[PDB]
Amino acid sequence: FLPTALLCAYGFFASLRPSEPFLTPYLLGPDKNLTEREVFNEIYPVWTYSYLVLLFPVFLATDYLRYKPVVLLQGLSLIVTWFMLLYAQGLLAIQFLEFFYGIATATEIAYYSYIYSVVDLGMYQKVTSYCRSATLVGFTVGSVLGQILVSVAGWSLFSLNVISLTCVSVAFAVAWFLPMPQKVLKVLWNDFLMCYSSRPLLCWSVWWALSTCGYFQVVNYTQGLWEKVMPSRYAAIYNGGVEAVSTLLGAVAVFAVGYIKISWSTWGEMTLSLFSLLIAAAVYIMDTVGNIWVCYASYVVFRIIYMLLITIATFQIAANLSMERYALVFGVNTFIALALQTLLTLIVVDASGLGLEITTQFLIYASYFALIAVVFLASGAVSVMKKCR
Numbered sequence: 001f002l003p004t005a006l007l008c009a010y011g012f013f014a015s016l017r018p019s020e021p022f023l024t025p026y027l028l029g030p031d032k033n034l035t036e037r038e039v040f041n042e043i044y045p046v047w048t049y050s051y052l053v054l055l056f057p058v059f060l061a062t063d064y065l066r067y068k069p070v071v072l073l074q075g076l077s078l079i080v081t082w083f084m085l086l087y088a089q090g091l092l093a094i095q096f097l098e099f100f101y102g103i104a105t106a107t108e109i110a111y112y113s114y115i116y117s118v119v120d121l122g123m124y125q126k127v128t129s130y131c132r133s134a135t136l137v138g139f140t141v142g143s144v145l146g147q148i149l150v151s152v153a154g155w156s157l158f159s160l161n162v163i164s165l166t167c168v169s170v171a172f173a174v175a176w177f178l179p180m181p182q183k184v185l186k187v188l189w190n191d192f193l194m195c196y197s198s199r200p201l202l203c204w205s206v207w208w209a210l211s212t213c214g215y216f217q218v219v220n221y222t223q224g225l226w227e228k229v230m231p232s233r234y235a236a237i238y239n240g241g242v243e244a245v246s247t248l249l250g251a252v253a254v255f256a257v258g259y260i261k262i263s264w265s266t267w268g269e270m271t272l273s274l275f276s277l278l279i280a281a282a283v284y285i286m287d288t289v290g291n292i293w294v295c296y297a298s299y300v301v302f303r304i305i306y307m308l309l310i311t312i313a314t315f316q317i318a319a320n321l322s323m324e325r326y327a328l329v330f331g332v333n334t335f336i337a338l339a340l341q342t343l344l345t346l347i348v349v350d351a352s353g354l355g356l357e358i359t360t361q362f363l364i365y366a367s368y369f370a371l372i373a374v375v376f377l378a379s380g381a382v383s384v385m386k387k388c389r
């Protein structure tokens with residue numbers, strides 16, 4: 001099991017970033033001296049902009065380069081990201097840092113499609129699940145390591161960032177010896193039309209994309225919300241346990257999603273709408289309680305419900321589509337998700353735009369998930385009217 005074990009070791013090491021938990025307290029700390037206005041209005045949105053603009057060329061280069069060099073591109077981008085996060089001041093350098101984080105994250109689809117051209121067709125699902133679990137274990141291990149090192153050990157965030165850079169460098173070293181994958185546009189667009197030219201073919205797609213949008217745009221500013229509620233100047237912040245338990249219970253929910261004896265056509269959209277309304281309630285609670293432990297708990301509830309929703313949505317999408325287009329659909333829906341996220345980010349987040357405060361944009365995010373709650377309910381009620389006949 002050497003080729004799969006090496007790949008899962010690479011996933012474990014690349015995903016083992018103990019500093020994503022403890023990021024905003026470092027960025028706004030004495031190490032870089034960046035004000036919350038500056039960070040949350042110009043630094044962070046560049047990640048979304050870069051991820052959007054680079055998802056398309058990454059997707060093209062992945063198939064153009066036979067899926068191998070994109071993994072090393074991800075490793076090198078992570079290495080330079082974690083070096084510049086050790087040594088960069090000002091604003092432009094950190095903006096390019098988030099650009100490099102974007103080019104790193106845009107290649108996750110490439111990393112997960114690398115498996116399809118090196119393994120057997122029958123075992124592809126099981127090895128993909130194994131690698132996803134490897135990434136989850138890596139992130140949980142990094143999260144608990146950072147929490148243990150910053151809570152009782154009293155280790156500064158600079159050394160923790162050094163650990164993050166060491167782990168991503170080890171990931172690059174592992175990736176360098178990965179076995180090579182030895183194994184129209186109008187028509188593809190016409191086939192893309194056929195990807196939604198049916199009753200269930202269109203379904204779950206835009207809701208997967210829009211829920212992914214909400215998740216992506218709330219996870220990173222949730223760090224800022226925790227910083228605002230509990231400042232890091234003279235208080236100990238327990239992020240690592242929370243980013244550990246969130247991923248752990250998300251994996252648990254992913255496992256439990258397949259054990260529910262429920263058919264899609266019966267109440268799938270109704271259950272998704274209920275889950276989305278619960279997500280909106282959790283976001284509003286996290287924004288408005290003013291207590292830190294309960295807002296971490298509501299964040300964990302968000303994580304669990306989002307993982308359940310994504311698992312059911314991607315199960316339905318995979319049932320709708322063929323195995324040869326898994327990467328294509330998972331790329332197109334992520335592309336439109338980042339497009340809508342960037343649109344809303346220029347509307348409410350970007351300093352050149354309206355630049356609304358972080359405590360205010362979460363009121364939109366709660367209403368934003370309340371907005372998808374209504375349309376999913378309305379589309380769910382649309383099937384109910386058809387179910388009447």
Ligand SMILES: Cc1ncc(C[n+]2csc(CCO)c2C)c(N)n1
Binds near residue numbers: 219
């Ligand atoms: C270096 C770096 N780390 C994380 C993010 C954004 N981000 C992605 S996932 C997640 C949750 C983990 O706490 C966060 C904050 C970034 N833009 N740059």
